Design a protein around this ligand. Structure first.
Ligand code: A2G
Ligand code: CA
Ligand code: CA
Ligand code: CA
Ligand code: CA
Ligand code: CA
Ligand code: ZN
Length: 391
């Protein structure tokens, strides 16, 4: 019922301060609150969407770990950027991880990543799909450093998130407090569930597809944290706080300038790693995002608003179209098929009213009308052409 956290929309401790959030759960997406699953209500950081604990042992069990337990579910804990021992703020860490993950669950749910779509909850409450798969949220996980990860089994088995301590800076930095990292990881769950249907989570394995797998997560983090005062000239890094590097962890900033970020589809012909390929894809989606935010407006709301089934603003419209595309694209998608799934998602959602804005963005970075995956590791033909008749 209270969570002392960096609030949603404040990516990390360099962007703002912590605040006590009272009952932030969305009543439709989290009908038992975050503290309940319809069997019981907890005073620990556990409930329908997530089971969060300090997994110091780094193992596969979440029942042998310390978890905060607060009377009244008032998770109000100290946190200092000067503390050198991360275990001293483990309660704040677990609370922040639980908060961000639950908030993201609630947003995704409103956008259609719900029970029947293959989402992550203990009790689907009659809404379809398979339960017993609330995300296991391992704060200060002992099994690694300077990273984070997510494991996605088929619907009905839990997704598992592991958040590590990053130690290239002193004091060390806990990536529970970098919301974009949590969002990136959780999105691995989303895209693996949606792509090829919720029973099949081996659909994003081929290099180009795993590349999009990385890019969707970066994209969702950047989109969530887009600010109303931003213009399309704004650039965003990935993980600049957790990595203690103003340029972030990717090779270029997310940017609508081809000079700042020169990546196009042809760039993938000289790439061999999912994280560089994912930077290409998230940059393409950043272009889409700005076209649609300009057309439909920005927002800093936590939940979308709908005209019928269509989100009112361009931020949630982009995110909806991206998620809807994941559920339309084939297993092992190419960039081209992922593009076509997004455009087809807009045909279904708005009758194709955003075709021009979509194609302009895709064409700008080499995924225009003539673009082709080709064959082999270097066979891609990029294109800047826009189909006739759309604009
Ligand atoms: C859930 O949220 C609102 C307010 O809590 C209403 O209860 C409504 O029934 C649900 N919202 C939507 C978009 O369906
Ligand atoms: Ca454990
Ligand atoms: Ca499920
Ligand atoms: Ca539910
Ligand atoms: Ca799937
Ligand atoms: Ca809005
Ligand atoms: Zn990733």
């Amino acid at each position: 019922a209270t969570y002392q956290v960096f609030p949603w929309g404040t990516n990390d401790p360099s962007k703002g301060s912590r605040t006590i959030e009272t009952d932030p759960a969305d009543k439709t997406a989290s009908e038992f609150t975050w503290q309940g699953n319809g069997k019981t209500t907890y005073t620990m950081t556990e409930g329908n969407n997530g089971i969060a604990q300090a997994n110091y042992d780094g193992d596969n069990s979440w029942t042998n770990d310390y978890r905060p337990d607060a009377p009244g579910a008032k998770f109000e804990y100290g946190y200092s950027l000067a503390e050198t021992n991360p275990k001293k703020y483990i309660d704040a860490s677990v609370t922040q991880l639980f908060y961000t993950a639950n908030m993201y669950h609630d947003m995704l749910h409103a956008l259609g990543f719900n029970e029947a779509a293959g989402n992550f909850e203990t009790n689907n409450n009659g809404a379809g799909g398979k339960g017993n798969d609330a995300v296991i949220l391992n704060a200060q996980d002992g099994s690694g450093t300077n990273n984070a990860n997510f494991a996605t089994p088929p619907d009905g088995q839990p997704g598992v998130m592991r958040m590590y301590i990053w130690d290239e800076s002193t004091p060390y930095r806990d990536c529970s407090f970098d919301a974009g990292v949590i969002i990136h990881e959780y999105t691995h769950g989303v895209s693996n569930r949606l792509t090829g249907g919720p029973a099949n989570t081996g659909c994003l394995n081929v290099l180009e597809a795993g590349g999009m797998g990385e890019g969707w997560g970066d994209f969702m983090a950047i989109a969530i944290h887009l600010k109303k005062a931003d213009t399309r000239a704004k650039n965003y890094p990935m993980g600049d706080w957790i990595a203690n590097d103003p340029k972030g962890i990717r090779n270029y900033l997310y940017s609508t300038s081809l000079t700042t970020n020169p990546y196009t589809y042809k760039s993938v012909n000289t790439m061999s790693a999912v994280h560089t390929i994912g930077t290409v894809w998230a940059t393409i989606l950043y272009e889409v995002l700005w076209n649609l935010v300009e057309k439909h407006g920005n927002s800093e709301a936590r939940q979308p608003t709908f005209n019928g089934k269509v989100p009112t603003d361009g931020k949630f419209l982009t995110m909806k179209l991206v998620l809807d595309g994941m559920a339309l694209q084939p297993c092992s998608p190419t960039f081209v098929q992922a593009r076509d799934a997004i455009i087809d998602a807009d045909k279904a959602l708005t009758g194709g009213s955003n075709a021009c804005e979509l194609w302009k963005a895709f064409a700008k970075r080499g995924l225009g009308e003539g673009a082709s995956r080709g064959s082999g590791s270097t066979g891609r033909k990029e294109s800047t052409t826009v189909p006739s008749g759309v604009c």
